[PDB]
Motif scaffolding. Structure first.
Motif, mmCIF file in Angstrom:
data_model
loop_
_atom_site.group_PDB
_atom_site.id
_atom_site.type_symbol
_atom_site.label_atom_id
_atom_site.label_comp_id
_atom_site.label_asym_id
_atom_site.label_seq_id
_atom_site.Cartn_x
_atom_site.Cartn_y
_atom_site.Cartn_z
ATOM 1 N N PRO A 231 -1.670 2.952 9.487
ATOM 2 C CA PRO A 231 -0.926 3.243 10.718
ATOM 3 C C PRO A 231 -1.722 4.145 11.657
ATOM 4 C CG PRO A 231 -0.118 4.596 8.967
ATOM 5 C CD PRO A 231 -1.002 3.548 8.318
ATOM 6 N N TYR B 11 6.770 9.126 13.502
ATOM 7 C CA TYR B 11 7.339 9.302 12.170
ATOM 8 C C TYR B 11 7.730 10.761 11.932
ATOM 9 C CZ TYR B 11 8.010 8.219 7.193
ATOM 10 O OH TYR B 11 8.540 8.020 5.939
ATOM 11 N N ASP B 12 6.818 11.682 12.234
ATOM 12 C CA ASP B 12 7.091 13.104 12.046
ATOM 13 C C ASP B 12 8.306 13.549 12.845
ATOM 14 O OD1 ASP B 12 4.897 13.526 10.348
ATOM 15 O OD2 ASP B 12 3.557 13.892 12.055
ATOM 16 N N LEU C 240 0.803 -1.222 0.000
ATOM 17 C CA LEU C 240 0.000 0.000 0.000
ATOM 18 C C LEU C 240 0.838 1.276 0.000
ATOM 19 C CD1 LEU C 240 -2.876 -0.997 2.450
ATOM 20 C CD2 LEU C 240 -3.093 -0.465 0.003
ATOM 21 N N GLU C 241 2.138 1.143 0.244
ATOM 22 C CA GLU C 241 3.040 2.294 0.252
ATOM 23 C C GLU C 241 3.608 2.507 -1.149
ATOM 24 O OE1 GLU C 241 3.839 4.366 2.773
ATOM 25 O OE2 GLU C 241 2.505 3.311 4.169
ATOM 26 N N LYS C 242 3.349 3.667 -1.748
ATOM 27 C CA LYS C 242 3.877 3.931 -3.084
ATOM 28 C C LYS C 242 5.400 3.915 -3.100
ATOM 29 C CE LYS C 242 0.184 6.290 -5.509
ATOM 30 N NZ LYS C 242 -0.162 7.436 -6.382
ATOM 31 N N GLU C 243 6.011 4.126 -1.938
ATOM 32 C CA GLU C 243 7.471 4.115 -1.826
ATOM 33 C C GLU C 243 8.055 2.733 -2.137
ATOM 34 O OE1 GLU C 243 9.965 6.305 -1.059
ATOM 35 O OE2 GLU C 243 8.567 8.003 -1.064
ATOM 36 N N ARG D 62 8.544 2.899 4.378
ATOM 37 C CA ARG D 62 8.229 4.224 3.855
ATOM 38 C C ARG D 62 9.392 5.170 4.152
ATOM 39 N NH1 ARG D 62 3.225 7.664 6.235
ATOM 40 N NH2 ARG D 62 2.064 5.829 5.481
ATOM 41 N N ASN E 48 6.220 11.989 -5.900
ATOM 42 C CA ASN E 48 7.536 11.387 -5.688
ATOM 43 C C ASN E 48 7.644 9.925 -6.093
ATOM 44 O OD1 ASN E 48 8.968 13.646 -4.676
ATOM 45 N ND2 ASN E 48 8.082 13.355 -2.633
ATOM 46 N N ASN E 49 6.511 9.294 -6.375
ATOM 47 C CA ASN E 49 6.515 7.890 -6.760
ATOM 48 C C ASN E 49 5.643 7.633 -7.983
ATOM 49 O OD1 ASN E 49 6.667 7.880 -3.428
ATOM 50 N ND2 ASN E 49 8.068 6.430 -4.417
ATOM 51 N N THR F 299 2.929 13.421 8.690
ATOM 52 C CA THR F 299 3.002 12.535 7.493
ATOM 53 C C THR F 299 1.594 12.085 7.125
ATOM 54 O OG1 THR F 299 4.075 10.560 6.556
ATOM 55 C CG2 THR F 299 3.219 10.386 8.802
ATOM 56 N N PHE F 300 1.474 11.331 6.037
ATOM 57 C CA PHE F 300 0.171 10.851 5.584
ATOM 58 C C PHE F 300 -0.200 9.504 6.202
ATOM 59 C CE2 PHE F 300 3.617 9.860 2.700
ATOM 60 C CZ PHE F 300 3.476 8.497 2.455
ATOM 61 N N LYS G 231 -1.857 6.876 4.635
ATOM 62 C CA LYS G 231 -1.472 5.871 3.656
ATOM 63 C C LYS G 231 -1.429 6.538 2.289
ATOM 64 C CE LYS G 231 -4.670 3.063 2.098
ATOM 65 N NZ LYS G 231 -4.938 3.715 0.781
ATOM 66 N N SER G 232 -0.700 5.942 1.350
ATOM 67 C CA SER G 232 -0.644 6.510 0.012
ATOM 68 C C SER G 232 -2.082 6.570 -0.472
ATOM 69 C CB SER G 232 0.194 5.632 -0.917
ATOM 70 O OG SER G 232 1.554 5.646 -0.520
ATOM 71 N N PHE G 233 -2.460 7.701 -1.047
ATOM 72 C CA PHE G 233 -3.825 7.896 -1.515
ATOM 73 C C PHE G 233 -4.194 7.044 -2.729
ATOM 74 C CE2 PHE G 233 -7.336 9.975 -3.640
ATOM 75 C CZ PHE G 233 -8.155 10.365 -2.586
ATOM 76 N N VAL H 156 -1.953 11.111 -11.029
ATOM 77 C CA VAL H 156 -1.149 10.116 -10.322
ATOM 78 C C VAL H 156 -1.553 9.936 -8.867
ATOM 79 C CG1 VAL H 156 0.799 10.499 -11.847
ATOM 80 C CG2 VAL H 156 0.636 11.800 -9.725
ATOM 81 N N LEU H 157 -2.498 10.754 -8.425
ATOM 82 C CA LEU H 157 -2.973 10.710 -7.055
ATOM 83 C C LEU H 157 -4.292 9.937 -6.965
ATOM 84 C CD1 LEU H 157 -2.398 11.919 -4.175
ATOM 85 C CD2 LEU H 157 -3.443 14.031 -5.004
ATOM 86 N N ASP I 223 3.731 12.440 -1.876
ATOM 87 C CA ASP I 223 3.956 10.998 -1.907
ATOM 88 C C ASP I 223 3.603 10.481 -3.307
ATOM 89 O OD1 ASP I 223 2.101 8.191 -1.260
ATOM 90 O OD2 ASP I 223 4.218 8.199 -0.671
ATOM 91 N N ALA I 224 2.530 11.018 -3.881
ATOM 92 C CA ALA I 224 2.096 10.620 -5.217
ATOM 93 C C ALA I 224 3.084 11.090 -6.282
ATOM 94 C CB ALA I 224 0.703 11.185 -5.512
ATOM 95 N N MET J 176 2.274 7.831 13.335
ATOM 96 C CA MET J 176 2.450 9.003 12.490
ATOM 97 C C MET J 176 3.205 10.113 13.217
ATOM 98 S SD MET J 176 -1.314 8.883 10.740
ATOM 99 C CE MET J 176 -1.132 10.256 9.631
#
Lengths: 457, 457, 457, 457
Positions: free
Chosen positions: C435, C443-444, C148-151, C383, D95-96, D1-2, D4-6, D285-286, D92-93, C440
């Motif tokens: 998460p 993470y920040d 689920l992480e685009k990273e 991530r 960047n990936n 931070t987010f 999860k990736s949208f 891309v989002l 996030d979108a 979060m």
């Protein structure tokens, strides 16, 4: 002669210009009047039998069902118009039905061939939650409980209560996700049970046309699985189903048309509802280009497929369809009682006896607890369905009718007080996917009662 | 009832906590005692018949085999413990055996369906070196000698003496290379013979679990080929086989469980060894989830599968298994004599008659020269096996028994002096893969003697 | 010149007749002596740098690593003998390494190409439990947290604590079941995340050769996934790995050879362990026919890959391998701290900076809590690994070295008191796989500290 | 931070509880106000340039587009609510994004990689009817006219006016039939042209979600084809598209998100509409998890994509997207003039110059006659699009801007009087699929005028 063999495209065309009619005129007049008319015209009387042996009465029932489809046609809810077939179009459909087909792949594939009334061959056992709601965290374990049973040949999909923690709301992206995920997870459960190629039947979690159409996918449903399209009640259909049919045909998918006539419904009583049932079996290979048809007569009050009346409807419809056509079919199981109860097992057993002896090719069950209670379906019910099918195979119809009368009498007075039963989590070791001693004892008790009635496992 | 249908996983679980027992207690006491006990209990007496017609004696043999498996269980060599089944688990396995399956692909695929005793249908002919050692430089030519015979339906793999000039030592990378290469080369031989899709049976060159498990690969063994797993002697198994079974099931591979009961072995004589044989046929569909079972009764002294005693064991076991179950099976061929000799052909012929008439679905041969002499196996032996199978199909069992008694008498006094025969290179034109006039003349001589006994080709 | 390009088969051959030697002579003498000798011979001194810029020192390190492999050879544990390579064989291997390859399929496939030191291109992010134990009931959810992480580009498999409620004991059928199931479930998790074609890296749950070899299967691992084979410590290997290599090659699988040199281990200190690391990177493309090599220098005491010493070893080894060869590689992540803690994130961040700047092609993490605590790995760590990789790409090496010194100083005094962290279930909504606010916020905090050091996300 | 990736699922969730708002408040206030606000805030002024060189102005435009998406969000027509993104989710979108991908299969496959402003590399030429209505009896011939042109790399599907002689009415079975048939026929046309593996872009004939979802099928659209999902105007979307996205992702399909901002539309003028364009490229891309984004700025009055204003919008948006992101994209062609006319060719040429020089990766055309006139699209227009792309590649931007100003001046006064042109049947030999001398002469005339402007073919 006919213009062209009838298909879903012709249906759409006719549904846009057919005779205008309100749904009430259809449900409260046209259907009940024709069923009443044909019942008397042919003097239909099942005389309390579950499975017929009187060929003359069966021929009359077949003619009645055929005539009903011919004279009534099919009501299209979207356009409020009636689609009519010609006699030649109906015969072209009946005369060219799929003879046989294979479900599943690899070592796990199974051949589906026609069975006759009282056939010595055992029907195909399609076990699963049968469309019942199953919690997301036990979706694979629950289906694995069926794949692990040697009695089960194919899987009938349950419904995901959630996917990624969200309800698969119709027309939402979650519905599409569930439609694809459903079978992907189920086939993975089958693989964990050492049978990666078991065929399945669905899609079930999706309800919209777009949701159902998204189910064919890599790792998910494919052409060797049964694709479900549902007819409405009675001799009725919506355009969504028509587009879904076009999709299944375009993908060369095995098509399973389903219809569950309601006893005490718009058609009327036993003989009336059976005329409708015969008509919808025929409509299956005409309107839906079905490979096989799934029946499921249900009691308007009890909502079960195994009441005395619904078993009689199924028995007569199937025996008659078997006698005059090569239409392949199955029946779906909806007991009142829930899992881990003796009644549930006896209820499914009564239907298995009826379905096996009357000639069904496939048994699709079991939707325990009427299939509306979360996680209340387990492989144990399918095991009984299958073992009872074997016991019934080859038994004289005269004896079967006696056994059925006695068995149904063992529970028909308890529909309103049917035991709620328990969930998969309560009667199975969820980790090893093994039934509890509790369930095993209940199972033995049901088996003993069946043996006392004359059944030999 | 049973907890769950029994599988290799349940076997492992039980093998770790079963009754402790030494292998000698098993081989020298438990097995021989039970075989002796059951033989007398049921009064088994084959009265010199190769194939039974006495249904009562057959029923007793079946009950004896079932009871032996039930009361003894299976000895696991790794854990020195005994795995026990319950009666319900055994019936669940027997009641749900694979009905039929397809071997091979494309135009070359063949359907394997049950044959009854004396069936008019001809069994499937699986021809090949039958696990015999074959020189690397003639691996394809040798197998091509079988693919080129129209009598042959599928191929049973030979063993590579070397791969890339090195011995395929167990647990060495060469074993893995051979496991994959073996079938890749064989299927290429089939393609050169104009039958690219012929199914095969293996793996054979590999001996370790890791070696056997590496055999499924692109261009090599696939799900439409028979995957071999071997049971030990008697009612015994090692954990390696159990893991191999898990692998075959996980790949949806057709599984061929094999067991070769030894006449004069731990069980005892004819009736005793036959009780064991029936028990291992049943164990095949229980422990190994087999699609079909490969038998191969062998003489403790002669090491052949076609002695009077071993033919009787096979005949009775198969006829009985055919009468009371739908378990699909075959028998493997191990003649004493080598290729290009009349005895070899007559030996294989005697077994083909026995196997065909007793109801086998598949004939797997021929391991000429007892399958232990390099390059001493050729397609000519499979041709005879097949032509004799056709001649036997449909013949009355009474006549078959007479023919067998006479035929076996033609060579049973010469086991110790069986002719060594010749290699593929010596009786075939290695380049065109065609038998020599020498072999053809030997072949004609054997055929004439068979015809004089009453066989009609 | 050389006889033939060296492969696993040649290794087996030589391992059976090589110089006899005890494992202690190897670990306590041969290896440490050569590392000590070469370190002084070439005057290796990293002068506290994490990533080298001194080309002359790098050339000396490369020559040292090459010479070590050449003069020592590889110890085979099974045969207690040493396998020796010739200079020409080593160059043939180095001169013909895989240039690039694709992982995954469909829309989700990614290209792996060489990255140079300080490259502006971002490395491939391989996220997953990284071999850590994961409870069976959350196996898919946990892996879904990475998909689920685009990273994340590919998945590195976690280990199933159980399959069907049983431990996947080596050489048991459950090990085979787990080997196949592992990736089948993971790819299903990827599909649920909308990325059905993500490539994976494994197998991980299996430990035996037979278990690892069974992992390639329909729906499971395939040729577009990275296949792991592990080297031992140091310049050592067992025959199991050699057979596994033969299997991967025979299936045309992308091969990932792994070796985790131990700082303070048999080689000695920093420069010594780095000489070994360079030698094992070269051995990867020689002995294992690797497509790419996975490093993982670990601290003998802390068991982490991100200590000052292990980062220096990785940095120098990779920068040097990048300068003189086209060998593709990655590094694996083992932080001391567990998930949902600032230290864990900072630890992985330090390694991501090191790996990205030193030229790694793939980052494989994160095995939080040293990868030995059940369910203590989540997508959040991956991530950070990925976002830090992007921030590091293109940054001057001089600046990177300064940042690393400062960052490592932020946690290197707390190895013994590293926070245990929490499990996936404790810091994620298990149903929606999202998460918690708690994580979060953690993470920040980590991100802010990294930005204060000069990193720009 | 987010969190999860949208993804499309998060969009659905937010669309059900977002800020309530009428569509008029969105179109007539929120969007125009923000575009006006940001234009002045950043002092955007394109100063008549088609393609920017001023990096500072480009950076301001990028920031404006980003800020617009961030502060406005996306309006969901179904729920009348606004979906809002956070800054971290957007990055996030961005960047990936997908780096590259392959379209088509076999010899005919092509790689799509990023092109920079003024890049020497030629963009991918996607030629076809571009969604224009094409008569059923010439569906394959028309598409073959594009496949036969070496200039064309992939095909952009036309729309079937009928299938089996019936209109593919949305939600009718004919729509499903057309969705599948469309690409099946087109790929067959490609095969007849000797390029069976050409990738395509669609589906186009279907309009409903169920219709679009049925397009993936055997012989039809597959994962190596571009799957279209359309955004609305402006910064708007319907739930149908959201479910279609879920479907494409679930099948691992290459996703092409499209949006055609309207000059003079809800956003306002040139700079305003360009801010929107940048915002929708990012949204691609989002929200849609796009592999690439298809632009298509259109004139509110003329309905063409090649007016002075629309070319400027495309030029600035693309050059800016190219400078600050790796988002892959293309532009679609809608000339006013019809086929076989000089204006049509000059119109498409102007856009090809703009798209090539501004950095597009793919050119998708040509929808001659505004793509609304039956059969008025032919491969000749795509040939010019491609040849002009080659001529433009590598040319200095300063020179390109001069050429564009001069070229556009050659037709911008004739929009209202644009020649209707002719159909495929009128300017091609329908049987051999070859253009007529008439068209060839028109083609030469256009080419000469382009050369006089400085273009070198």
């Amino acid at each position: 002669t006919f213009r062209k063999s009838f298909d879903c495209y012709d249906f759409y065309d006719r549904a846009k210009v057919g005779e205008k009619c309100t749904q009430d005129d259809w449900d409260l007049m046209k259907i009940p009047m024709k069923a009443m008319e044909l019942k008397q015209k042919y003097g239909l009387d099942f005389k309390g039998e579950f499975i017929p042996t009187d060929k003359d009465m069966m021929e009359k029932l077949f003619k009645a069902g055929f005539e009903m489809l011919l004279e009534c046609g099919i009501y299209c809810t979207d356009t409020h118009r009636i689609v009519k077939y010609t006699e030649d179009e109906i015969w072209d459909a009946i005369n060219n039905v799929q003879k046989e087909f294979v479900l599943g792949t690899g070592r796990d594939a199974v051949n589906v061939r026609k069975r006759s009334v009282g056939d010595k061959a055992k029907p195909i056992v399609q076990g699963g939650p049968t469309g019942s709601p199953i919690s997301e965290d036990v979706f694979m374990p629950v289906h694995m409980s069926y794949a692990l049973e040697k009695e089960v040949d194919t899987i009938v999909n349950g419904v995901m209560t959630s996917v990624r923690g969200k309800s698969p709301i119709p027309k939402s992206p979650y519905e599409v996700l569930a439609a694809k995920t459903e079978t992907r997870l189920i086939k993975n459960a089958c693989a964990m049970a050492g049978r990666p190629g078991m065929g399945v039947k669905g899609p079930e979690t999706s309800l919209s046309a777009q949701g159902n159409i998204s189910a064919d996918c890599t790792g998910g449903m494919t052409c060797t699985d049964s694709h479900e399209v549902s007819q409405l009640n009675e001799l009725k259909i919506d355009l969504d189903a028509i587009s879904v049919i076009a999709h299944y045909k375009g993908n060369s998918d095995i098509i399973m048309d389903e219809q569950m006539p309601i006893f005490g419904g718009y058609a009327g009583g036993i003989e009336e509802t059976t005329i409708v049932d015969v008509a919808t079996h025929i409509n299956a290979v005409l309107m839906s280009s079905a490979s096989w048809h799934l029946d499921g007569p249900v009691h308007i009050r009890w909502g079960s497929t195994n009441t005395r009346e619904t078993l009689m409807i199924a028995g007569w419809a199937c025996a008659t369809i078997s006698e005059f056509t090569d239409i392949l079919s199955g029946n779906q199981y909806y007991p009142c009682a829930g899992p881990c109860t003796e009644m549930c097992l006896l209820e499914a057993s009564a239907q298995s006896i009826t379905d096996t002896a009357s000639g069904r090719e496939i048994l699709s069950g079991v939707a325990s607890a009427k299939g509306v209670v979360t996680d209340k379906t387990t492989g144990m019910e399918a095991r009984m369905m299958g073992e009872v099918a074997r016991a019934t195979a080859g038994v004289e119809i005269s004896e079967v009718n006696v056994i059925l009368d006695k068995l149904v009498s063992l529970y028909e007075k308890n529909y309103a007080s049917a035991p709620a039963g328990k969930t998969f989590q309560e009667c199975y070791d969820v980790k090893t996917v093994t039934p509890t001693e509790e369930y095993m004892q209940v199972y033995d008790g049901a088996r003993k009662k069946l043996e006392d009635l004359g059944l030999v496992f």
